[PDB]
Amino acid sequence: GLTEEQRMMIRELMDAQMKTFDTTFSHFKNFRLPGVLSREEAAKWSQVRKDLCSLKVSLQLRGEDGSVWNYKPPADSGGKEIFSLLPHMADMSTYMFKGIISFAKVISYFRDLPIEDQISLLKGAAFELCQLRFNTVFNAETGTWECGRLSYCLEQQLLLEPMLKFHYMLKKLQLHEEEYVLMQAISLFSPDRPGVLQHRVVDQLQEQFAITLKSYIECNRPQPAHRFLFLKIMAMLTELRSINAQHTQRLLRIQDIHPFATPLMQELFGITSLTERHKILHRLLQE
């Protein structure tokens, strides 16, 4: 069984997730939508075109009245059209990042850290926590992320893209809500994020969440069958960390030639003292 402490750790994470994860995206509003519309630089563009190809989705918006708007992105032609969904995706990402910041803030263990460590951990884990939450709304039979009234439908070859293969593989583990949130806590309290100062304290907090998850699995899942479920989860978190680094690099390349990041995204991703370089994040953690 779980110790009283492990049970309480899970309760706090579950309370934090229930208060800050808008699972139906009911409060995601006022977002932008695609509208009715040289040697070195050429290289930059070429790498970017590749960057965008992989994650191509159509967008579906279901109205209250029963109507449906569907958006099929353009094929890659000359150029600029390839960025048509960027403003929308920047709004969705920003909305998800705010929910991830709120999550962390409700956690005692996280609040007890020095503000600059709170900042450093959130910058290092934001994308990872967003992907873990998006996996819960991922429909693997249709290749769709079902976000309330919004849906993003992917447009063997897919498995080639590390982010898609991650969603398929994680979904197949059929995790419990508790296991997802513990995964979120482990990613969040990663002692090795750039700029972390209380490395030892974070490292120990991470080990506690990892032990709680290992014990949750031993106690709540049928024996032999789920013998290596904890290790498969840890492998998925290692892979997610690699996808996060690949993502940041892709984001920076795109931003370089076609700015689209929101102010909060700029802070999270390093786009243009640690509290002075992250005033928005600081204010969000301060309130």
UniProtKB/Swiss-Prot annotation:
The keyword DNA-binding applies. Residues 5-272 form the NR LBD domain. Keywords: Activator, DNA-binding, Metal-binding, Nucleus, Receptor, Transcription, Transcription regulation, Zinc, Zinc-finger. It comes from Homo sapiens (Human). Signal peptide: none annotated. It comes from the Eukaryota. GO terms for cellular component: chromatin; intermediate filament cytoskeleton; nuclear body; nucleoplasm; nucleus; transcription regulator complex. Nuclear receptor that binds and is activated by variety of endogenous and xenobiotic compounds. Transcription factor that activates the transcription of multiple genes involved in the metabolism and secretion of potentially harmful xenobiotics, drugs and endogenous compounds. Activated by the antibiotic rifampicin and various plant metabolites, such as hyperforin, guggulipid, colupulone, and isoflavones. Response to specific ligands is species-specific. Activated by naturally occurring steroids, such as pregnenolone and progesterone. It is found in: Nucleus. The chain holds residues 142 to 432 of 434 of the full protein. Expressed in liver, colon and small intestine. This is Nuclear receptor subfamily 1 group I member 2. One of its GO terms (molecular function) is DNA-binding transcription activator activity, RNA polymerase II-specific. The keyword DNA-binding applies. Hyperforin binds at S93, Q131, L132, R133, F134, H247. Heterodimer with RXR. Interacts with NCOA1. Interacts (via domain NR LBD) with CRY1 and CRY2 in a ligand-dependent manner. Belongs to the nuclear hormone receptor family. NR1 subfamily. GO terms for biological process: cell differentiation; cellular response to molecule of bacterial origin; intestinal epithelial structure maintenance; intracellular receptor signaling pathway; negative regulation of DNA-templated transcription; negative regulation of transcription by RNA polymerase II; positive regulation of DNA-templated transcription; positive regulation of gene expression.
